[PDB]
TrEMBL record:
<feature type="domain" description="AAA+ ATPase">
    <location>
        <begin position="69"/>
        <end position="249"/>
    </location>
</feature>
<dbReference type="GO" id="GO:0005737">
    <property type="term" value="C:cytoplasm"/>
</dbReference>
<dbReference type="GO" id="GO:0016887">
    <property type="term" value="F:ATP hydrolysis activity"/>
</dbReference>
<keyword id="KW-0813">Transport</keyword>
<dbReference type="GO" id="GO:0030257">
    <property type="term" value="C:type III protein secretion system complex"/>
</dbReference>
<keyword id="KW-0067">ATP-binding</keyword>
<keyword id="KW-0547">Nucleotide-binding</keyword>
<protein>
    <recommendedName>
        <fullName>protein-secreting ATPase</fullName>
        <ecNumber>7.4.2.8</ecNumber>
    </recommendedName>
</protein>
<dbReference type="GO" id="GO:0046933">
    <property type="term" value="F:proton-transporting ATP synthase activity, rotational mechanism"/>
</dbReference>
<dbReference type="GO" id="GO:0008564">
    <property type="term" value="F:protein-exporting ATPase activity"/>
</dbReference>
<dbReference type="GO" id="GO:0005524">
    <property type="term" value="F:ATP binding"/>
</dbReference>
<keyword id="KW-0843">Virulence</keyword>
<keyword id="KW-0653">Protein transport</keyword>
<dbReference type="GO" id="GO:0030254">
    <property type="term" value="P:protein secretion by the type III secretion system"/>
</dbReference>
<keyword id="KW-1278">Translocase</keyword>
<dbReference type="GO" id="GO:0046961">
    <property type="term" value="F:proton-transporting ATPase activity, rotational mechanism"/>
</dbReference>
<keyword id="KW-0963">Cytoplasm</keyword>
Length: 346
């Protein structure tokens, strides 16, 4: 009841919503420790500051929206915009000692499609908390806490942990159904009070620590409708950074489909050099100001301003696009990413 068993043997394993290994082995993993699913957690005694970069191995993010160790980061994405591919790139590229994944509320098919993106070397440092759509709501809700608790266990060993929860949206729908079942009323958008109060309690467990850390990425699944998602809204107000993927970029075959102007890192200025910050700011402005040259040629115009800002954007388009667009096998170290950024704004 509300305790799970943990240990190093969790690494490389598929684990259910309450922490039980799901692969059938004749020899069971050794999991000698019990931990509560809930933590007080790390009392502000004392609370830390985010001041070191957390490298994802994604040029657009590392370059223009740099993450920090112990940050809480949201990725907001609808269907068919390459979310799972981006999550895969992050797991394979991130500077994390241990990855704890919570895969909540999707069908087995989607789980296997994600797992296929992770090579043996990545899986070997992963704990995979998986609760598919068919599982009871209680199990899908608990998966978020199980994952968080396991991340804390590994943090406590001095590991820099990446907690990746796909998705807080489906966690919340599970927690909704549990809450309503207990007799809570709908307060906003079909959600009872319990789900809202759980969000900061979960997110506040990520963060830097004396030894080790937990940097957390939470996905928010966007519906192709105009219905308010109050869970996503509350998350927006808590996060330290947010990455937004758009259908508009996905349909241009622009991947990762990150809209830079809608994305932000509240910690970047604290974890990158002033020169890095300056180059990123120019790159962002160049991205925002760019306009298809076709549009001027078709009206016979010899523009070229003299409009300095717009002229550089066209001149630097291919460089900028090759920088922010990045294939799965298009690998880039943090050193290389920064060197490449300076090149695209030159
Ligand atoms: Ca909203």
């Amino acid at each position: 009841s509300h305790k799970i068993r943990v240990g190093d043997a969790l690494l490389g394993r598929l684990i259910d919503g309450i922490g039980r290994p799901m692969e059938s082995n004749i020899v069971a993993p050794y999991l000698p420790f019990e931990r509560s699913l809930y933590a007080e957690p790390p009392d502000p005694l004392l609370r830390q500051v985010i001041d070191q970069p957390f490298i994802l191995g994604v040029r657009a993010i590392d370059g223009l929206l740099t993450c920090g160790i112990g940050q809480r980061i949201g990725i907001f994405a609808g269907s068919g915009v390459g979310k799972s591919t981006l999550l895969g790139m992050i797991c394979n590229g991130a500077s994390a000692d241990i990855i704890v994944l919570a895969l909540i509320g999707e069908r087995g098919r989607e789980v296997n499609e994600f797992l296929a993106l992770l090579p043996q070397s990545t899986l070997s440092k992963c704990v995979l908390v998986v609760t598919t759509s068919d599982r009871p709501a209680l199990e899908r809700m608990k998966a978020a806490f199980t994952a968080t608790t396991i991340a804390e266990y590994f943090r406590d060993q001095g590991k820099n942990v990446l907690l990746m929860m796909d998705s807080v949206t489906r966690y919340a729908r599970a927690a909704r159904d549990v809450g309503l079942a207990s007799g809570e009323p709908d307060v906003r958008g079909g959600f009872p009070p319990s789900v809202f109060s759980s969000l900061p309690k979960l997110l506040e467990r990520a963060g830097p620590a004396p030894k080790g850390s937990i940097t957390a990425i939470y996905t928010v699944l966007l519906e192709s409708d105009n219905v308010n998602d109050p869970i996503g809204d509350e998350v927006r107000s808590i996060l330290d950074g947010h990455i937004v993927l758009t259908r508009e970029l996905a349909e241009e075959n622009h991947f990762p489909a990150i809209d830079i102007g809608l994305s932000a890192s509240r910690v970047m200025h604290n974890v990158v050099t002033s020169e890095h910050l300056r180059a990123a700011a120019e790159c962002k402005k160049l991205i925002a100001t760019y306009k298809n040259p076709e549009l001027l040629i078709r009206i016979g115009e010899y523009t070229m301003g003299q409009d300095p800002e717009a002229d550089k954007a066209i001149k630097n388009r291919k460089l900028i696009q090759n920088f922010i667009q990045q294939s799965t096998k298009d690998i880039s170290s943090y050193e290389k990413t920064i060197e490449s950024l300076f090149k695209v704004v030159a």
